[PDB]
Amino acid sequence: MYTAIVNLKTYREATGANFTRFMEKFEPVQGKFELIFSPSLLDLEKAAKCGKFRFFAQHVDAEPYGAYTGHVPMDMMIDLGITGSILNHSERRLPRDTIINTLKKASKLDFTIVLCVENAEEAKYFREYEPDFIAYEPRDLIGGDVSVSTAKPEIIEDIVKIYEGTGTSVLVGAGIKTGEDVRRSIGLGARGILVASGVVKSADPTKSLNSLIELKLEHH
Amino acid sequence: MYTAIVNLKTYREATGANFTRFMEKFEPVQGKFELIFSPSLLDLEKAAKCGKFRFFAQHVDAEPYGAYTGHVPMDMMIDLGITGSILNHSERRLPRDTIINTLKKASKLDFTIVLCVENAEEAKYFREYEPDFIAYEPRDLIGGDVSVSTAKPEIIEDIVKIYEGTGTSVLVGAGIKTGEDVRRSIGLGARGILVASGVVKSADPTKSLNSLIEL
Ligand SMILES: [Cl-]
Ligand SMILES: [Cl-]
């Protein structure tokens, strides 16, 4: 299957009392894409216990249970029923040694990391630590005048080439505005997408997500 | 009244399913001390809906609602029913400009900050921004061989003096092991305590806290 991740960030439409109302707009889909939502840290327990989809955290800490005021430990997430997290997003960047420590612990506990990077040097640097997914958010794909269907193909091809023959899947996390951008990304070697305001701030979130993941399949 | 804050940190005994069991058993306090609990960030929405005690966060961000992946905004806390937070704890220290931005927003929204500091220079630096509480955690009160009842009185007296006549209450957040330590702190001008493992990890948490706050 391909993978689509919808990041709720801290948007007013999809956090706090609005989390439940927002999620009622969607129904679990059986199909070629697995759908994963990323709720805010303050909503994560409610999503784990009572939500209808697979959920990943927005950020996770490597520290164990103990004297860690203001942390969100991986071992606590596992006990709530959460099986993965986004890490190093452009809005939540981390020191390199912190990222290495977290990737090493996740490998040991079979917890899934979606590691965000901004360029090919970062992508190569972290290769040997084996992230489950890489989410690519390069500056060349960010702008109102630009998208994957319009940009040079080398942007995505270079990162896919770095991870050729590893167990790591590549997702595209900038320049996704339509279904044509999604289908072109897969043609270039990506295995899915990471999206946010294009779904969350839509006048019809359900229809906006369906347009991105529609494949026009025949059934028997 | 005086104030006692019990910080749950991320201890196994008072997180997740164990949060619910811990709070079910713990008895409400009456008398001269008000109790406030500080649950982990992952437990905070559940604590707000429970409401058996007054609950403050362990850390808070100044960012509003919007595009802030992995943050815990003040405005989201307020909308859940949480009215205060600890800030700049020794385990969660912050840049000075971030602390100032947070104190200024809290003042505007009537949100209560318990600001942790480690020395008299830090205490004086933040005085003009009017924190509601100061929690003092100095190196001289940290150790298995040290406590308030055996340390020099000047340690606490200097910080009380800095905040004399302001609206800020001074709490002692290190060197508190027995009732004798609490009574000596109040004798030196403090208005309460911030404690953690001594209550949370106890075989009988209710009784351990009562032993500290009997006067
Ligand atoms: Cl523990
Ligand atoms: Cl918003």
Numbering used by the authors:
A (entry chain D): 1 to 220
B (entry chain A): 1 to 215
The authors write:
Triosephosphate isomerase (TPI or TIM) is a functionally and structurally well-known enzyme that plays a crucial role in glycolytic and gluconeogenic metabolism. TPI accurately and efficiently interconverts dihydroxyacetone phosphate (DHAP) and glyceraldehyde-3-phosphate (GAP). The overall structure of TaTPI protomer confirms to the canonical TIM-barrel fold with eight α-helices and eight parallel β-strands from 216 amino acid residues. Unlike other thermostable archaeal TPIs, TaTPI forms a stable dimer in solution, which we confirmed using analytical ultracentrifugation and size-exclusion chromatography.
In this work, we report crystal structures of apo- and glycerol-3-phosphate (G3P)-bound TaTPI, each representing open and closed form. The crystal structures of apo-TaTPI and its complex with glycerol-3-phosphate (G3P), an analogue of the substrate glyceraldehyde-3-phosphate, have been determined at 1.94 and 2.17 Å resolution, respectively. Crystal structures of apo- and G3P-bound TaTPI contain four copies of TaTPI monomer in the asymmetric unit, comprising two homodimers. Overall structures of apo- and G3P-bound TaTPI were similar with r.m.s.d. of 0.69 Å for 216 Cα positions, except G3P-bound area. In addition, water molecules around the active site of apo-TaTPI are expelled from the active site and would be replaced with substrate upon substrate binding. In the crystal structure of apo-TaTPI, Cys50 in helix 2 of each homodimer drew our attention since it interacts with the other Cys50 from adjacent TaTPI homodimer via sulfur-containing hydrogen bonds, not disulfide bonds. Thus, we needed to re-confirm the oligomeric status of apo-TaTPI to make it sure whether the interaction of Cys-Cys is physiologically relevant or crystallographic artefact. To verify the oligomeric state of apo-TaTPI in solution, analytic ultracentrifugation analysis (AUC) was performed. Data analysis using the reversible model (Eq 2) gave large negative Ink values for monomer-dimer (1x-2x) and monomer-trimer (1x-3x) models and much higher RMS values (~10−2), so the reversible models for monomer-dimer (1x-2x) and monomer-trimer (1x-3x) equilibrium would not be the case for TaTPI. These results strongly indicate that apo-TaTPI exits as homogeneous dimer in solution. In addition, analytical size-exclusion chromatography results of apo-TaTPI, which were confirmed at two different TaTPI protein concentrations (0.9 and 4.5 mg ml-1), also supported the dimeric conformation in solution.
